[PDB]
Amino acid sequence: VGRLIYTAGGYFRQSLSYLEAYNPSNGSWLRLADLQVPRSGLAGCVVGGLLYAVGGRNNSPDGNTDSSALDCYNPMTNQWSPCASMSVPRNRIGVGVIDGHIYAVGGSHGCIHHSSVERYEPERDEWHLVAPMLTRRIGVGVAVLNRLLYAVGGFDGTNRLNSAECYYPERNEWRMITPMNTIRSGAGVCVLHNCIYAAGGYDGQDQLNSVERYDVETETWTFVAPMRHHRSALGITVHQGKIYVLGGYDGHTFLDSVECYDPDSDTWSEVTRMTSGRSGVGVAVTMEPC
């Protein structure tokens, strides 16, 4: 975990540069140093207490630019630093961290929907391609459990997907897993205990409030309680054994709603509001700044 839930970037009217941190302990939000470049459809992750913002797209009134950028935020300094860029731009990207390396998964570059996957090594400041997924996936949910990487749902250029697959690093190989019971593009995907959770998303017709989880031992998906708000392009993270979902789009409003899931009571509750409604944020947890 760490201490704060950091939300970076996102979309409302145009791509956003906001970096804001929420403190579950007191309900407070802090506005921190803006991203150097606005971006929506990015992912966040943490390695060695540093926050990384990965990929996305700058949707601006002066043009639209898919991002291959990797940028690093140090809470100690309140400063963003550029890292090596990825091989390709990846809007609507998913990311997972294994053994202190960042896996960038899928995403789009204009009409190109990637199946490619690449791995960042912070000691080297270097990206390297690994085996591609079996499926092109943008708006892909990514989680890590037991040092295996999961790519869940998304959009292949033609169809939104219920499919999911797993990457075995020591084999450099992807294999399909049991598909979800729901087609989901732009779901929030995370791990809690022995399960991969997929919350919300878009099925090609409707934004979803439903939530399902994959037990790696049983290889089956089970629905849990739905969120209070239907949402796609949400941010998701885990903080002290609870899932937090941030923002997204319900087909009417860019949501400021933050919901929290308690696995013991199988209930969602409203915990806070983001300072403004937005979709396509990057979210991760690390220590409080300065």
Binding-site ranges for ligand S0W (CB under 6 A)? 41, 92, 139, 155, 160, 185-186, 202, 232-233, 280
CB 43, min distance to ligand S0W, A? 9
Contacts of 226 (CB under 8 A, 6+ apart): 209, 210, 211, 268
Structure tokens at 171: 């084999």
Q: CA distances (Å), 51 to each of 47, 75, 83, 126, in order? A: 7, 8, 12, 17
Structure tokens at 222: 């089970």
Name beta bridge partners: 211.
Answer: 199, 224
CB 282, min distance to ligand S0W, A? 9
Phi and psi at 88, nearest 5°, equal: -145, 150
Cβ atoms within 10 Å, residue 100 = 11
Contacts of 30 (CB under 8 A, 6+ apart): 4, 20, 21, 23, 289
Q: CA distances (Å), 210 to each of 32, 112, 189, 198, 254, in order? A: 32, 29, 12, 9, 18
